[PDB]
Write a protein that binds this ligand. Structure first.
Ligand SMILES: [Zn+2]
Ligand SMILES: [Zn+2]
Ligand SMILES: [Zn+2]
Ligand SMILES: [Zn+2]
Lengths: 197, 197
């Protein structure tokens, strides 16, 4: 009766948050966003997204690193795979593009754990942790991975974002604030045995 | 990039649901329930509970087996560990007592996966997927395990309960109906690769 995965956490002050040039979104509006999803659905089929959950602690409390676009939406580091691209190689590529260093030193990402699957049935905001009834052609499939951080690292945050450390209690039961994927991270992380280093 | 645990599911019509004698709760009221939790906290410290998530399918849709007490509360099969009792040996004991056969043939339970941890800070209903801020002496610790069923089995359901098969969509976003632990099973099960046999 020890069936829990053991995960090392490190103090938030072990990490350095530098800056770099703005990184802009592919879509300048919700309307544009759902227009491009329709155009690519017809060319290459279901959109495949990957997202990384990076965890630290301070005074032995776990926090999730979220990206805040200006003072607007909160999001996980991640993005869209290319057709034929490996899910894990793709998440590493995407996290290097977002938080990789201005001095071009190669970050060592460790990804060994799936934590969830979400599905978007239509060209619309709703997403579910299962393929809903009667849906044969889902429009997006999103996969969440736990990213084990090294003891220390330097991250370069695009100047148009802030990297914030959110305690679990602030996420919990807070879908209006964060939406249904980030609001359910406390439940999804409860199975891990965290070591507070 | 295959980091998902693979789980075999079987059709609900593969299983037989027999009956047996009523099984009564230790507490005849909420008030009694929280009174006994206080008395045992003082004698043996934090209550340790274990709960099992049993999954089937029909026409390739996953369903969770829930116990319904009369036409009142829904609950997972499980209960309270004794002091010094192994969590997994204890869940097997508890599931044999609840659903074990009237003919005394030994059910083979397979338990290889933790899916969650919940904590009760006070002698009161609220439970959280983490130890909340300022809480040093939690009053209950609850652990959820995925139970892999065999291809076929006969279960004996106490006459005061019904064993119901709930589709995920009915649980999803339905805390008022089911409470916060069962309502978040769809999120907690999304990481598995289910085989629909
Ligand atoms: Zn400290
Ligand atoms: Zn899919
Ligand atoms: Zn069928
Ligand atoms: Zn505990």
């Amino acid at each position: 009766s020890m069936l829990e995965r053991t995960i090392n956490l490190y103090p938030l002050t072990n990490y350095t948050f530098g800056t770099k040039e703005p990184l802009y979104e592919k879509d300048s509006s919700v309307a544009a966003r759902f227009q491009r999803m329709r155009e690519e659905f017809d060319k290459i089929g279901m959109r495949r997204t990957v997202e990384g959950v990076l965890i630290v602690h301070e005074h032995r409390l776990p926090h999730v690193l979220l990206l805040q676009l200006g003072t607007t939406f909160f999001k996980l580091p991640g993005g869209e795979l290319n057709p034929g691209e490996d899910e894990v190689e793709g998440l590493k590529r995407l996290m290097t593009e977002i938080l990789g260093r201005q001095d071009g030193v190669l970050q060592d990402w460790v990804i060994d754990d799936c934590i969830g699957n979400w599905w978007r049935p239509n060209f619309e905001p709703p997403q579910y942790p299962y393929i809903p009834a009667h849906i044969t052609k889902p429009k997006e499939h999103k996969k969440l991975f736990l990213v084990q951080l090294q003891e220390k690292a330097l991250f370069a945050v695009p100047k148009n974002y802030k990297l914030v450390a959110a305690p679990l209690f602030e996420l919990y039961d807070n879908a209006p604030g964060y939406g249904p994927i980030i609001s359910s991270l406390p439940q999804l992380l409860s199975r891990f045995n965290f070591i507070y280093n």
